Amino acid sequence: GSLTEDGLSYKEKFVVRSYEVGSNKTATVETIANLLQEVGCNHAQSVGFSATTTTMRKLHLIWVTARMHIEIYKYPAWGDVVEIETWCQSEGRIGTRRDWILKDSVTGEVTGRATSKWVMMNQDTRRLQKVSDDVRDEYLVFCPQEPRLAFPEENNRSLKKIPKLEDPAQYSMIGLKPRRADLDMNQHVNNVTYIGWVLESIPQEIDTHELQVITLDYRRECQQDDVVDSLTTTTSNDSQFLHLLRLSGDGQEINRGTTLWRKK
Amino acid sequence: GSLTEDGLSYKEKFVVRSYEVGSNKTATVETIANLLQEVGCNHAQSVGFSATTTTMRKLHLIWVTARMHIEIYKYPAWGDVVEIETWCQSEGRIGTRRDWILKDSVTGEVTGRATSKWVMMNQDTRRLQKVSDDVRDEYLVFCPQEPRLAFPEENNRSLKKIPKLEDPAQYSMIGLKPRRADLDMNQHVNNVTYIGWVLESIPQEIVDTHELQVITLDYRRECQQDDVVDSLTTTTSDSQFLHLLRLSGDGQEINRGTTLWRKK
């Protein structure tokens, strides 16, 4: 992979692996989400990070995902090469946004797009905070200054408000817990695991559809010793679902989201 | 990746990804096992397999792993390039063996090695069978004829007999169940998931202070999509452990194995 000529975005190519595909012999949405995370990490490394700035590491501050939105038109097949372009944009004092464009390397056509909202949090107390000028000045030189949106459209699905699922849920998967493969290098549950857990409450029959859109709001983390319940209710040619992940015991919300599926 | 000059082995290079590493910023043993599986698949594709041969497909016969043995001297770091060489050998009428050699792409030094025993099974009845003669002749042209062993030495750990763990187990992780990310493209639980489940009963104190050096795993029965597994471990000693995976209900054995850990 490499930074583009202007140094304001990063591209990388990936060959889809045998264990990365589902029943249709195409990449799962979790494989896609792992590749978005990998190209984001490679971009941060290429521009001098290790994505905490100098002032952030001094103040024990980190970027955390508040929302992730992915739209897939075509999932790449096993053995196919997918090219992904990523970049960051400042959103004033609210936080930052990382966007992605996925393309078929052979045709050059756009096969998917993703966007994510990131907030500044103290690593120790987990308290959120606005972006200071000192921190902002350190990362603005790595972002395009004019707007560059993966989802330009006026009433697009990436910024919609998500409601809280009401009991009883239509579908559920109970007692989900992470294993060591679900953790990142800092021993925290990887963001992609939550997408997998959301999808566990979708019935196997829904074999007949392809996932087109997924929007996920991250509220709280699942710790290593926590157990999660995954809840889903149909809200709808296309099937739409409302999702909720909550801790098995007290019922504390950890995530909420929506999925849109289209008939194969 | 590509077949070597003689067409009797296959090599491929992999760049270690951010989500593929553990707390030491080096590849997990599950990442290694996924890469061995991927290079094995690429080898079978390069030599004309759609690793079932024409006669196997007509007879509804498949290759299944009976035993896997991996020894790691150094785990590649995040961003490092690891080169893996693989080949197959015929073992008379018992079945086939696939071997692997892992190397640091920069130094050319051997950083690990693996071996696996495969048996022929009817995909519908799950009945084991010897390899006939028509089937052997179809894949012997893709194997070196003289012996080529990843573990040549006499009395090597790759061929040792593994006993059955006696109750009570010293350590345990109960109620493990696969999610969709744990399945392969044929909707069966991926072999690497079983390695993860075995490792779930090792205490965090051991993982934090030791590195896994050797793992031998015997595969006896499948965990189906609706099954629940219990992972059991007892120290038999470097630290050595004896492992057992069994179904949560009836206690039916699915796997047994051993691990050897070196103090960091």
Ligand SMILES: NS(=O)(=O)c1nc2ccccc2[nH]1
């Ligand atoms: N944006 S947040 O609500 O502070 C937040 N982001 C998260 C990402 C993963 C897990 C928990 C999180 N909590």
Ligand SMILES: NS(=O)(=O)c1nc2ccccc2[nH]1
């Ligand atoms: N994204 S998160 O899961 O909320 C999170 N919080 C963290 C605190 C310290 C180190 C890594 C972290 N990751």
Ligand SMILES: NS(=O)(=O)c1nc2ccccc2[nH]1
């Ligand atoms: N994957 S985990 O839930 O973080 C975890 N922590 C563990 C500590 C001891 C034994 C197994 C474990 N699995």
Ligand SMILES: NS(=O)(=O)c1nc2ccccc2[nH]1
């Ligand atoms: N060799 S076997 O005992 O027939 C066998 N191999 C297997 C691999 C994965 C899961 C179940 C298996 N059963």
Ligand SMILES: NS(=O)(=O)c1nc2ccccc2[nH]1
């Ligand atoms: N290796 S296994 O998990 O025992 C297995 N059995 C299978 C039968 C049909 C298709 C794939 C299979 N994989």
Ligand SMILES: NS(=O)(=O)c1nc2ccccc2[nH]1
């Ligand atoms: N990953 S799995 O255990 O094969 C599985 N099968 C499922 C069927 C319906 C809903 C969730 C599921 N998860």
